[PDB]
Amino acid sequence: TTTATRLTGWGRTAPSVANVLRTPDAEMIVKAVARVAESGRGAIARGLGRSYGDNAQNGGGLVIDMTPLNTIHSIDADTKLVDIDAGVNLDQLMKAALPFGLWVPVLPGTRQVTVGGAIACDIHGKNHHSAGSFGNHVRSMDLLTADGEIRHLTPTGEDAELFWATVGGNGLTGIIMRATIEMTPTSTAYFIADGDVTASLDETIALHSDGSEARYTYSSAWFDAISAPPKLGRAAVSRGRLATVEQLPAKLRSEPLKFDANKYTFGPIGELWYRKSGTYRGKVQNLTQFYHGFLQYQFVIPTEAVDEFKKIIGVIQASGHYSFLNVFKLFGPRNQAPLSFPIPGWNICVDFPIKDGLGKFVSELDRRVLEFGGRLYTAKDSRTTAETFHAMYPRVDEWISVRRKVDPLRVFASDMARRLELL
Numbered sequence: 001t002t003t004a005t006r007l008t009g010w011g012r013t014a015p016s017v018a019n020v021l022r023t024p025d026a027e028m029i030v031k032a033v034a035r036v037a038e039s040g041r042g043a044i045a046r047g048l049g050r051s052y053g054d055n056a057q058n059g060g061g062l063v064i065d066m067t068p069l070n071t072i073h074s075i076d077a078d079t080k081l082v083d084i085d086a087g088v089n090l091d092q093l094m095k096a097a098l099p100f101g102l103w104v105p106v107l108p109g110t111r112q113v114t115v116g117g118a119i120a121c122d123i124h125g126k127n128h129h130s131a132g133s134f135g136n137h138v139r140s141m142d143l144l145t146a147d148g149e150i151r152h153l154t155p156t157g158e159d160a161e162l163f164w165a166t167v168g169g170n171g172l173t174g175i176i177m178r179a180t181i182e183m184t185p186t187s188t189a190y191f192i193a194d195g196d197v198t199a200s201l202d203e204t205i206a207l208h209s210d211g212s213e214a215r216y217t218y219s220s221a222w223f224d225a226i227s228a229p230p231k232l233g234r235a236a237v238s239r240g241r242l243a244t245v246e247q248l249p250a251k252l253r254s255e256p257l258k259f260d261a262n263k264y265t266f267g268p269i270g271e272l273w274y275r276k277s278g279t280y281r282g283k284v285q286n287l288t289q290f291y292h293g294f295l296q297y298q299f300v301i302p303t304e305a306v307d308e309f310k311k312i313i314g315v316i317q318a319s320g321h322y323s324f325l326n327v328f329k330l331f332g333p334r335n336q337a338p339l340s341f342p343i344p345g346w347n348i349c350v351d352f353p354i355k356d357g358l359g360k361f362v363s364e365l366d367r368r369v370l371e372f373g374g375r376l377y378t379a380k381d382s383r384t385t386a387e388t389f390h391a392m393y394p395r396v397d398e399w400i401s402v403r404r405k406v407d408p409l410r411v412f413a414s415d416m417a418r419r420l421e422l423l
């Protein structure tokens with residue numbers, strides 16, 4: 001029933017060979033786990049493999065593909081609850097739930113992620129500072145544990161601890177079979193967006209600490225990480241909120257929940273265009289418009305350590321490693337998941353062309369991120385060390401304890417668990 005497959009994350013790196021079970025039958029799944037528990041490198045769940053790291057692979061072990069288990073069981077406009085299999089992806093869920101006036105409460109940059117993957121990495125999106133991360137919206141889940149049993153976890157139940165260990169747990173508490181999400185009510189599929197441009201890193205920080213952020217539910221920025229100061233850190237800021245029907249152009253009010261470089265570019269006229277183009281108010285945009293080899297590196301620095309955040313950006317541009325695609329956002333309050341990535345503060349994504357001395361430069365970045373109280377993201381990472389990770393996540397020991405109570409025999413395991421000593 002299993003097939004030896006060669007697996008990588010989305011980074012197409014650190015490949016490993018595992019036995020990939022793929023069945024729409026939850027019974028084959030439960031019994032495949034029981035077949036790992038009476039024997040040795042254990043088992044890990046895999047979703048759509050959008051995670052860049054090595055969390056959804058398990059060298060010389062069992063990897064269980066969950067995408068066949070993609071039944072949407074029900075959606076209820078009144079309770080706002082959705083009840084689906086872990087294999088359902090968020091694009092699928094988005095499209096099924098619009099007709100009910102329901103919005104997926106946390107959307108990441110690609111909708112090709114499963115619900116299991118969204119929970120296990122506790123993903124965040126453009127609205128983190130107003131909605132939190134994915135785990136905040138899970139009202140229940142069914143977790144296939146090492147003992148072959150299915151446990152029904154809730155956020156505030158008597159199983160709260162294992163619930164919040166599973167959130168952001170990178171699949172190391174067992175297999176999420178099914179969950180119940182509370183959605184966000186919406187009257188349209190549209191955003192009303194305000195656009196802003198900055199000329200300096202200092203301007204960017206100002207804009208994000210002036211209180212304007214509280215007027216928008218969604219907010220993120222494209223961010224210059226190549227130009228030398230004080231042009232370094234200038235940003236195209238896109239902020240907004242879901243539009244109501246009364247704010248749509250009348251052509252759309254009929255169907256409000258529907259879904260579907262020249263010579264000047266670098267001169268003063270180019271700079272002018274880019275400011276004009278990137279500055280606006282109340283622009284209505286659908287989801288696509290408003291959301292628009294390499295080493296993907298993402299960290300967050302606590303809010304108060306702002307000067308340290310600036311320092312790291314300066315180190316980056318002067319490093320000779322150039323990143324064009326840079327997403328900046330200020331996270332809001334965190335949640336009670338010990339291994340949850342987001343904390344309030346300065347979040348950034350950078351894309352580094354694989355190049356000489358880059359591996360060693362990012363190790364230094366790790367040191368800086370750590371020294372400054374921030375952390376990396378497992379959904380992005382494959383190269384950091386156990387010691388660095390354990391120091392970045394001070395509640396890791398708390399988490400490991402929970403994980404030990406629930407999988408004493410190390411039935412669930414992955415490349416990452418072994419690398420980061422989470423096993």
Ligand SMILES: Cc1cc2nc3c(=O)[nH]c(=O)nc-3n(C[C@H](O)[C@H](O)[C@H](O)COP(=O)(O)OP(=O)(O)OC[C@H]3O[C@@H](n4cnc5c(N)ncnc54)[C@H](O)[C@@H]3O)c2cc1C
Binds near residue numbers: 049109110114123
């Ligand atoms: C283009 C792009 C844009 C992205 N943007 C964002 C973003 O804006 N915000 C953000 O937070 N992330 C973002 N990501 C990362 C992505 O959201 C996460 O890596 C997500 O976890 C991937 O989901 P998946 O179903 O592909 O999971 P996989 O990558 O297949 O698995 C990821 C982790 O989830 C676990 N898992 C999967 N299914 C289950 C299950 N059924 N039960 C238990 N554990 C399971 C796996 O074991 C593994 O630990 C982006 C990724 C890409 C490629």
Ligand SMILES: *N(O)c1cc(C(=O)N[C@H](C)c2ccccc2)cc(C(F)(F)F)c1
Binds near residue numbers: 109219220291292347
């Ligand atoms: N990283 O801090 C980060 C990345 C995204 C994101 O959507 N990235 C994908 C790869 C993307 C790259 C280039 C253009 C479009 C999409 C989103 C965030 C967020 F915090 F959600 F805004 C952060």
